[PDB]
Amino acid sequence: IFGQIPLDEIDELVTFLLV
Amino acid sequence: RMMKDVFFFLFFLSVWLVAYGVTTQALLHPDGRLEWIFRRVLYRPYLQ
C-alpha cells in the first residue's frame, strides 16, 4: 500500500483488485 | 451506481496503460521467451 511491491517474493486478476 | 460505469472506464484506462508498457518495452530492447518478457512487462506496469 506504501509503494513496496516485492515481485521477488510474490510472483513466480490481481491488477484488477488493486485498481 | 458509480462502479457500474467504473467497470468500462477501468477497461479503457487499462488498455491505455498496456499500450504505454508495450511502447516502452519495444523501445528498451527488442527476449524470445514469452513468460520472461510478459511477466516482466506486467511487473513493470504494476511497479513503475
**Residues B42, A15: C-beta atoms closer than 8 Å:** yes
What dihedral angle (degrees, nearest 10) is formed by the CA atoms of B48, A18, B20, B31?
A: 70
Contact A5, B47 (CB under 8 A): yes
The cell for B7 is 467497470
Rg (CA), chain B: 14
CA–CA separation, B16 vs B21, rounded Å? 9
* Helices H / strands E in chain A, number of each: 2, 0
Other beta carbons less than 10 A from residue A12's beta carbon: 5
Query: Which region holds residue B3: left if phi is over 0, alpha if psi is between -120 and 50, else beta?
Result: alpha
Which residues of chain A does B43 touch, with a Cβ-Cβ cutoff of 8 Å? Answer: 7, 11
Resolution in A: 4.3
**Residues B10, A7: C-beta atoms closer than 8 Å:** no
* Breaks in chain B after (C-N > 2.5 angstroms): 30
The experimental method behind these coordinates is: cryo-EM
